[PDB]
Amino acid sequence: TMAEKFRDEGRDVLLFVDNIYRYTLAGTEVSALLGRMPSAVGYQPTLAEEMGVLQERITSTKTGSITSVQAVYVPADDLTDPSPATTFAHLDATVVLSRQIASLGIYPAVDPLDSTSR
Amino acid sequence: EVQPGNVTVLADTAIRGQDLDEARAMEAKRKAEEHISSSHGDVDYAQASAELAKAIAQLRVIELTKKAM
């Protein structure tokens, strides 16, 4: 919301979100108590809508622009877990870090065969 | 070659001659001026090598096991 307010003033803004995964995770913890039947690997049924309702309002417009960097934790290093898989679609540039490269001491541990950009 | 109380025959293994050896050298030169090469007779190595080439092919082990190297 603060990023959006700075955008609407006609400015251009930087937005750094240090772990967006924890936004979906905090929903899962609550999802079962709200009386909703569990989905694929435990996540709430509304995972993709809960994620899109946020990711879709962080965007540039004709009055102002938001340039954003989001950290995206992947659980158990599984890039096919529903949350990373459903997050991949919302980004323009995806830089995929990997543990195998980091164990070689090669920082930054970017995987060039998986990072891409629009 | 014969010695006191000993003798040896250093026998040739094939007929030797001015013309035969020159024919063999001529073929040895031709095979090098071209790039023509023959096939070794080790059918056992051929069998095992093709079997190992097909068995090792396309098995995506690395990146299946998380082995960096």
From TrEMBL, chain B:
Intracellular or extracellular location(s): Cell membrane
Domain ATP synthase epsilon subunit C-terminal: 19-63
Domain of life: Bacteria
Subunit text: F-type ATPases have 2 components, CF(1) - the catalytic core - and CF(0) - the membrane proton channel. CF(1) has five subunits: alpha(3), beta(3), gamma(1), delta(1), epsilon(1). CF(0) has three main subunits: a, b and c.
Function in brief: Produces ATP from ADP in the presence of a proton gradient across the membrane.
Stated family: Belongs to the ATPase epsilon chain family.
Name of the molecule in the record: ATP synthase epsilon chain
Organism: Escherichia coli O145:NM
Full-sequence portion shown in this chain: 71 to 139 of 139
